[PDB]
Design a protein around this ligand. Structure first.
Ligand SMILES: NC(=O)c1ccc[n+]([C@@H]2O[C@H](COP(=O)([O-])OP(=O)(O)OC[C@H]3O[C@@H](n4cnc5c(N)ncnc54)[C@H](OP(=O)(O)O)[C@@H]3O)[C@@H](O)[C@H]2O)c1
Ligand SMILES: NC(=O)c1ccc[n+]([C@@H]2O[C@H](COP(=O)([O-])OP(=O)(O)OC[C@H]3O[C@@H](n4cnc5c(N)ncnc54)[C@H](OP(=O)(O)O)[C@@H]3O)[C@@H](O)[C@H]2O)c1
Ligand SMILES: NC(=O)c1ccc[n+]([C@@H]2O[C@H](COP(=O)([O-])OP(=O)(O)OC[C@H]3O[C@@H](n4cnc5c(N)ncnc54)[C@H](O)[C@@H]3O)[C@@H](O)[C@H]2O)c1
Ligand SMILES: NC(=O)c1ccc[n+]([C@@H]2O[C@H](COP(=O)([O-])OP(=O)(O)OC[C@H]3O[C@@H](n4cnc5c(N)ncnc54)[C@H](O)[C@@H]3O)[C@@H](O)[C@H]2O)c1
Lengths: 94, 440, 372, 369, 437, 90
């Protein structure tokens, strides 16, 4: 809803419906790994915390931003690993 | 920042692509790799975000953050996975809440909308943080799995939150650095409170609900600062997560509101599609036809489905019960009509020791013939030779409602842990079953 | 260690045998001695040496029944068998008291235990012993085979460069074990078939194969299980619409029977007269009466062009499979008389108590108590 | 303005009528007068009043041939109609001189034009006239029916409370028109069917209907490459195959020749008790050696039936087709409703047995000497 | 910070949700309920565009456009519907080329890329307008044609295009009034010259092609004028039309590039009715012949009489049966056939070997077994399996062919029989003969 | 009106992937009436032709805008009435 107001308000609703339709008509045996996949995708918080940490000023901003980068790095690196191991039960043992 | 936005645009697409391919049967595996390259580029592009400082501090929080997670996941067992998503989900809500507080302590914006989305994103983040760790603690056994109640908690949750909101809104006119962490701990507190009444079995749906909550938060927080990648991926997971929440509640034969509080076996309804799911990927399938197939004149939609399976290489066999139907050889004639080869037609004695290796058992309009009441001498079903359909690793039954067989007894096979139920007219369902299998 | 016998049947035109060498083979595998008469399976094309290989014993009649505990007959055993009876021996097989009234009253003077196979109850237990189902199956089959053999018409809708032949229209009047069997094979050949009955459950059994059920202006059945008792304003429209529907038919296969009475008439003189020439009347109910007025037992007749056939023993003509289906009916029923190859009868049983005709000169069956 | 005559067939055991009343109506509306003898279709269940409802004149047998130009017979005309004929008049119907030599010599002594219905071209142009086509299908359908009738075995597979019945394994030897409908009807019944023929093209037509073909390997077109090595390729291979059989329907025939011995003596000894052999080729010898013509025989346990005139049994439809065969053949002889034969069309030129008395067909003319 | 923008955001959602609800059959009915408000809402919102003049002139052109088309849409027969899409698809294309035209006479682009998005939209606008007017001319009939296909046309058509492009790119540094006109003329020239090698059949693959084009045009012009509704909806229409053209190109025997033994056995109407009444499973396979004669109303009357007797009746619908997309659909709609009797190929193909009689009416290539092999021209066809049915009846006047240019080998098979005569003159004879049985 | 480059290119891409996936699950029965709607939808081309006509000054600018609105409103009200009756056939 900014850069500029209306442009990203479109974006928001255009992403709200697109993500919706992408998840309509999904099978049942794949309910958890896609949830593990989405958990990883929203691990993007790093990029924004990297900036926030790269723009840390008051020292108290230096630690809580240091936390977020780890908190995000754990959501990402931990999201990928949980999604890969769920997909190997969908493969035959060679 | 043309190179970063162009990257954040390339990053934007890869996610949607990843999200799409991770939803489908065959592309499921490859979907996660598409999303894996996006993160590498995005983070590699924000290394070049203009005015980046504290690099030796950035590299280390990447180091001890990327391994602490990677370690925790590869070594643990295969059944402790529901909780592992929750905690990684939790930390993601924490990571969004952390981006929120920083620009709130700066006073970096005097914009009244950006602040409101930074704050509102920070609220739901801390809630999605501490909520997922309480959710994490219940499946692990560190905390009481069963719903935890205390007298009059519907006015404790709702007034802890009601303040968490009024204090969040106060940061607009008065962003004193003494009403911000109290807003943050109120959300870290409401995070704990609202994930206390949810049952240990009711926990998966809560984790998907917090997975949406983290996704939503990183959307609004991604909007609060000029960050396209966050804007894209946030609401993309958020909007996915809430749909993810309802469908996972639809499967558990419940609704999302029942799990948010909630303060020999049973029948199991399955949709026409999820049956085609188990059927597109099996190896040993056996059709068990009964009198219901006859009343529906289904034979032609059944044989059509069986051929669709023979092509996928799936081993299809037919089990005709001696008394299946109402006359002797009732099925044999109706299957000779559709054009079913006679080698695919085997009787009980040469097929019963073959059932423990049969994956899915599709019963169609049969009841008394498949009933495991026939083994016991106490039933009016004894004496009749029995079809060992319950030994099959999975079972799917076809019939309109509750209508009984001839003799007039209930079937305890329907209630089985390995047996699922499909409702509606016989050939009307097979048609829907054939239609869904070609779609995959 | 039990012994069980199986005889050569005496009734005119019977080509069956109670036990086949295969079922005999698994009963000596069960643990029993089998006594067989000289040439009993010869009607079902199982030679004398076919049983000896199984582990039985081939002997002459009279020497057959001395020692035995179980007798396995197709039709009710005659004089010379009834007299050869020992006490504590069980007579298994068809009796049909109404037709074999003599052979019945003969069994009382020697006080023998008889169980009639026609009185097997119709729950699930003895469906693997349900002989009523197995033999009426064989009959209804040949009922249709003969119908195409004798029909001057294509049963199939025959389409060629010569012209369009419509499929023959067949009506099954009485829809039971033989009826459904007849209905099915008629559609196998391509005939457009009709099915007459009164039971709304039988009219559902009909359409399951692909037949249009005959519902007159007066449905004779409704709610509970009871059929209608027509007065003087209704058994005529049942007859009239039943006379007009039958009029436009090429084959009428009729199977209506009752366990104690002579066959009720579905095809009257006037229904007969309104039949076109070239029409085929098939009558399986001839073994106890016959549904058509002009049916004479065991002979093929023609009047006004209409051909009427009445066969007593159809399982005899398809003797190979019929006997085979009959022997396992006894084998799954041997699960109620034989115990690990030892004479263990079960007087407590609900199939036995609900089929046992007598208990050593003691008629349990109320209806068999009724006819005497 | 043309006149068609329909005679009563008087050969030993026939009920086929040449024209059904339903066809005569297309001819009476097609411009012609039709004369029918008193009581002709009463074998095919077409009464006198049925014919007079169409537009025909019911007359006496002596009255039958007064002015009539065309004579439509089922079997070759007896000699009491050969003499009541008219000049230039052309007879239509089976003549088959191998059973009627002396009646054939009777038509050529009188000087009457004749057309034989076992001479119609076997190309797809003349399938709407083809009698033996419409009279080999009617037999083959019945070839399967009599097989099941005499069979003490079940044709279809049936799973009942009393065991698993296996399908009767049926072989249909020599698959022509009689062979094709002997398979399908047996298939209709639910029998596992097989079909043998010396020709590659009758192995593919048989596979088309559903049966698995027997294992080759000759040519013989079209008993020519069959007698190369003198039938020790025919007798050797399917002796082991017939050992699994429940049924054997044989239709194999050669035009004018003896029926090639397909089922010998050492082949019918390996046959199981209750096995059935139906032999349609009983009217010119026998495919099997045990076929007594017209009688239900039984040796060792294998019943042998040799059915003469099977279209006779299915009279109503065999006649219905045969009359249409004659009606569609009448489009080359009747122009709007006036006697107009075509001496120049290739169908009449390869079938015209005698014109003005002179026997035009090849060997036909042979033996009569 | 504005309320004219707020309309457009609600405007676009209604377009998208409408679209979403239009895509699926159960809710398609409430679909046009949603986009119609998005059109009623958008027009009203732009009256409040700051400092609008010529207010008397705008409202006139609005009523002149609206009432003229509203009338033409309702009063035209249902079969003549493919070109109505094309002409409105033209109108919009013209209206898109106009937005490019006026904002180039003023010299009102302070950016190089914006002109490059304004001119490129007009390129698409003029082409999609004029091409849909030639498509119009070839479906209607006042100067109908198949492909003209003149020698070495692919060299002179690719010459015109490249020359329009050079004139177009000449506007960047030289926005002369002369450089504006020729560009439009050449775009209107190419737009026509391009719809010359297009078949009076292949037009379905061209109208949506022009429909997607009009979408792209509208998309780019919106980006050029800073108009968010034309931004969103334009690309929301174009991309839909894009996939649409491909899905209805590959549903055709064709791709997105080719555009730019036995004996006949006759039968009587009385003989064919006998096959119908005793026939259990019947399937009607309709084509162009049903359309030319207008037999549709005599086809459902046979589908209902069979159903009153019991006969299980279904309609096999080849997506390419006719001279437009879903030609069978809208005619089997205008008559009143239930859509659940209407089955496309893939859901009804494995049903045929058990279909007692497969009646085919005025169809040839859709049911031609030549489409199976790589030797004959009909390859690439989603084939309609009518040959495997037990009995086939074909309705056509005499010895005529279809579109691709081949005789049908279905006619000659042992199972198929022909029914000669005018389409509805045949079916009425089928009904009245079946009524007599 | 103020719309940036990266904000617009996202929109562009978002509504692109949006429509794509709406249309993925279409029945064959809908193709023609479904085509009639998209034909109607892009009839929003009046709005732009109206905006530009309310901004014309010279003698030749005022004309083509008047042309663009007649085409546009004809694409508008024309697409609506062809689909209303096509959807009525349900
Ligand atoms: N075969 C013989 O010779 C013979 C002889 C004597 C007795 N029997 C009796 O026959 C019975 C055979 O048992 P069975 O298991 O094969 O059949 P069953 O036990 O009678 O079960 C039939 C079931 O099919 C379902 N059904 C009916 N129409 C349907 C439709 N259109 N779509 C979907 N489902 C439909 C019905 O449930 P809904 O109503 O809920 O759909 C019904 O419960 C035995 O119990 C035996 O006692 C047979
Ligand atoms: N619909 C589309 O999407 C589309 C678009 C473009 C191209 N195509 C092409 O068109 C072909 C479609 O085949 P189709 O079977 O639908 O149509 P078709 O092959 O064009 O068949 C048309 C037939 O209808 C018959 N006919 C015309 N008027 C008749 C009347 N009054 N009575 C009876 N019959 C009449 C004609 O035969 P007689 O002259 O013998 O009567 C003619 O052969 C495909 O090959 C495809 O490539 C389809
Ligand atoms: N399933 C069962 O419960 C059951 C019961 C009895 C017999 N059977 C079996 O069914 C087979 C065939 O018998 P069916 O049932 O087809 O015969 P069916 O159904 O034809 O019934 C007998 C006939 O008697 C007539 N009838 C009876 N009462 C009448 C009255 N009051 N007024 C006028 N008409 C009357 C009816 O018209 C009927 O057609 C037999 O082999 C038998 O073993 C089954
Ligand atoms: N449109 C068509 O496809 C069509 C239709 C009808 C007839 N025809 C032709 O008509 C001809 C006549 O057939 P018909 O019905 O009079 O034949 P028929 O009734 O006399 O039967 C004889 C069949 O047995 C086969 N045979 C011959 N010698 C044999 C041997 N030694 N062993 C085993 N089998 C042997 C022959 O191939 C023939 O098919 C056929 O050759 C056929 O090509 C074609």
């Amino acid at each position: 809803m900014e850069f500029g107001f209306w442009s990203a308000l479109y974006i928001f609703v255009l992403t709200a419906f697109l993500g919706y339709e992408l998840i309509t008509r999904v099978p049942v045996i794949l309910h958890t790994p896609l949830m593990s996949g989405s958990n990883f995708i929203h691990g993007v918080v790093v990029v924004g915390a990297m900036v926030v940490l790269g723009h840390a000023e008051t020292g108290l901003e230096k630690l809580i931003g240091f936390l977020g980068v780890i908190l995000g790095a754990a959501n990402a690196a931990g999201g990928y690993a949980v999604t890969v191991r769920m997909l190997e039960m969908f493969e035959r043992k060679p | 920042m043309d190179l970063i936005q162009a990257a954040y645009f390339v990053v934007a697409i890869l996610f949607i692509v990843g999200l799409k391919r991770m939803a489908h049967p065959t592309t499921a595996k490859s979907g996660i790799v598409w999303a894996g390259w996006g993160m590498v580029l995005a983070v590699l592009a924000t290394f070049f975000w203009p005015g980046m400082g504290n690099f030796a501090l950035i590299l280390l929080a990447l180091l001890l953050g990327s391994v602490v997670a990677w370690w925790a996941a590869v070594r643990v067992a295969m059944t402790d996975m529901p909780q592992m998503v929750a905690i990684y989900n939790g930390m993601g809500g924490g990571a969004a809440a952390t981006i929120a507080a920083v620009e709130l302590l700066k006073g970096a914006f005097e914009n009244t909308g950006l602040m409101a989305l930074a704050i509102l994103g920070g609220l739901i983040g801390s809630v999605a943080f501490t909520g997922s760790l309480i959710a994490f603690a219940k499946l692990q056994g560190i905390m009481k799995s069963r719903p935890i109640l205390f007298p009059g908690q519907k006015a404790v949750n709702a007034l802890v939150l009601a303040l968490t909101v009024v204090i969040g809104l106060s940061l607009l006119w008065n962003d004193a650095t003494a009403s911000i962490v109290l807003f943050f701990l109120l959300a870290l507190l409401f995070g704990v409170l609202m994930t206390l009444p949810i049952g240990g079995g009711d926990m998966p749906v809560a984790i998907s609900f917090y997975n949406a909550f983290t996704g939503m938060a990183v959307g609004f927080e991604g909007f609060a600062v000029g960050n396209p990648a966050l804007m894209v991926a946030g609401t993309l997971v958020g909007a996915a997560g809430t749909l993810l929440t309802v469908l996972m509640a639809r499967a558990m034969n419940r609704s999302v509101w029942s799990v948010l509080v909630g303060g020999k076996g049973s029948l199991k309804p399955i949709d026409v599609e999820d049956a085609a799911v188990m059927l597109a990927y099996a190896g040993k399938v056996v059709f068990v036809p009964g009198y219901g197939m006859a009343l529906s004149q289904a034979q032609h939609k059944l044989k059509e489905l069986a051929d669709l399976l023979e092509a996928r290489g799936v081993e299809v066999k037919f089990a005709i019960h001696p008394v299946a139907g109402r006359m002797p050889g009732h099925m044999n004639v109706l299957l000779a009509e559709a054009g079913v080869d006679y080698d695919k037609l085997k009787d009980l004695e040469e097929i019963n020791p073959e059932f423990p290796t049969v994956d899915v058992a599709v019963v169609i309009g049969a009841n008394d013939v498949v009933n495991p009441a026939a083994r016991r001498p106490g039933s009016p079903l004894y004496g009749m030779p029995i079809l060992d359909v319950d030994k099959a690793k999975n079972v799917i039954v076809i019939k309109r409602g509750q209508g009984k067989g001839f003799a007039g007894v209930e079937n305890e096979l329907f209630y089985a842990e390995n047996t699922r139920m499909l409702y509606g007219d016989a050939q009307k369902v097979l048609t829907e079953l054939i239609q869904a299998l070609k779609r995959l | 260690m039990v012994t069980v016998a199986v005889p050569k049947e005496r009734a005119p035109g019977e080509r069956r045998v109670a036990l086949v060498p295969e079922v005999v083979a698994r009963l000596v595998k069960g643990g029993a001695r089998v006594r067989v008469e000289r040439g009993a399976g010869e009607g079902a094309y199982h030679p004398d040496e076919a049983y000896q290989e199984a582990g039985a014993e081939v002997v002459e009649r009279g020497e057959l029944l001395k020692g035995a505990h179980l007798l396995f007959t197709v039709q009710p055993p005659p004089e010379d068998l009834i007299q050869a009876l020992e006490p504590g021996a069980i007579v298994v097989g068809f009796v049909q008291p109404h037709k074999n009234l003599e052979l019945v009253r003969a069994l009382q003077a020697k006080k023998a235990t008889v169980i009639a196979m026609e009185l097997i109850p119709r729950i699930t237990r003895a469906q693997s012993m349900d002989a009523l189902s197995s033999q009426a199956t064989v009959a209804g089959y040949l009922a249709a085979i003969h119908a195409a053999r004798l029909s001057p018409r294509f049963f199939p809708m025959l389409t060629t460069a010569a012209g369009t032949i419509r499929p023959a229209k067949v009506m099954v009047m009485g829809v039971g074990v033989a009826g459904l069997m007849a209905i099915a094979t008629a559609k196998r050949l391509g005939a457009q078939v009709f099915a007459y009955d009164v039971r709304k459950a039988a009219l559902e059994q009909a359409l399951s194969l692909g037949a249009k059920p005959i519902e007159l202006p007066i449905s004779a059945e409704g709610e509970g299980g009871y059929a209608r008792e027509l007065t003087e304003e209704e058994k005529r429209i049942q007859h009239e619409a039943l006379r007009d529907h039958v009029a436009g038919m090429d084959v009428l296969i009729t199977t209506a029977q009752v366990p104690g009475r002579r066959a009720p008439i579905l095809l009257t003189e006037d229904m007969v007269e309104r039949l076109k020439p070239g029409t085929v009347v098939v009558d399986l109910a001839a073994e106890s009466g016959g549904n058509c007025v002009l049916t004479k037992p065991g002979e093929v007749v023609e009047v006004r062009g209409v051909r009427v056939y009445g066969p007593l023993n159809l399982p005899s003509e398809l003797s190979v499979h019929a006997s085979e289906m009959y022997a396992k009916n006894l084998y799954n029923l041997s699960s109620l008389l034989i115990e690990k190859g030892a004479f263990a009868p079960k007087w407590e049983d609900e199939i036995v108590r609900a089929a046992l005709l007598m208990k050593e000169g003691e008629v349990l069956h109320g209806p068999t108590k009724a006819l005497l």
